[PDB]
C-alpha cells in the first residue's frame, strides 16, 4: 500500500520534471543561437548604500 | 595589383560563406530542438514506374 501510493506521486514528479526539463533545454537551444553574447562580462555603476557601487 | 583584385573577390565569396553555414547552422540547432524524431524511418509506398515502389 504504501509503495503503489509512493509510486504514482513518483509517476508525476519524473513527468513534471521531463517537461520542465524539455523547457529549459527549448530556452537553452534559442539562448544559444540568438542571445549568446561573446564579449566579457561587463561592471554594473549604479547609487547605493553611502555612494555608487560598481 | 593582382592580388589586391583578387582579395576583393576572395573576401566577398567567405563574406557570402560565412553567412552560408550560419543558416546551414541556423536552421540544424532549430530541427534539433523542435521537430528532431527519435522513431525509426519509414519507407514510402507510392506507385513509380512498372507498379508500386517502397
Given at each position: 500500500?504504501?509503495?503503489?501510493?509512493?509510486?504514482?506521486?513518483?509517476?508525476?514528479?519524473?513527468?513534471?520534471?521531463?517537461?520542465?526539463?524539455?523547457?529549459?533545454?527549448?530556452?537553452?537551444?534559442?539562448?544559444?543561437?540568438?542571445?549568446?553574447?561573446?564579449?566579457?562580462?561587463?561592471?554594473?555603476?549604479?547609487?547605493?548604500?553611502?555612494?555608487?557601487?560598481m
Open positions: 500500500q504504501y509503495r503503489k501510493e509512493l509510486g504514482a506521486q513518483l509517476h508525476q514528479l519524473v513527468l513534471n520534471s521531463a517537461r520542465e526539463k524539455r523547457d529549459m533545454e527549448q530556452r537553452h537551444v534559442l539562448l544559444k543561437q540568438k542571445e549568446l553574447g561573446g564579449e566579457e562580462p561587463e561592471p554594473s555603476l549604479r547609487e547605493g548604500p553611502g555612494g555608487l557601487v
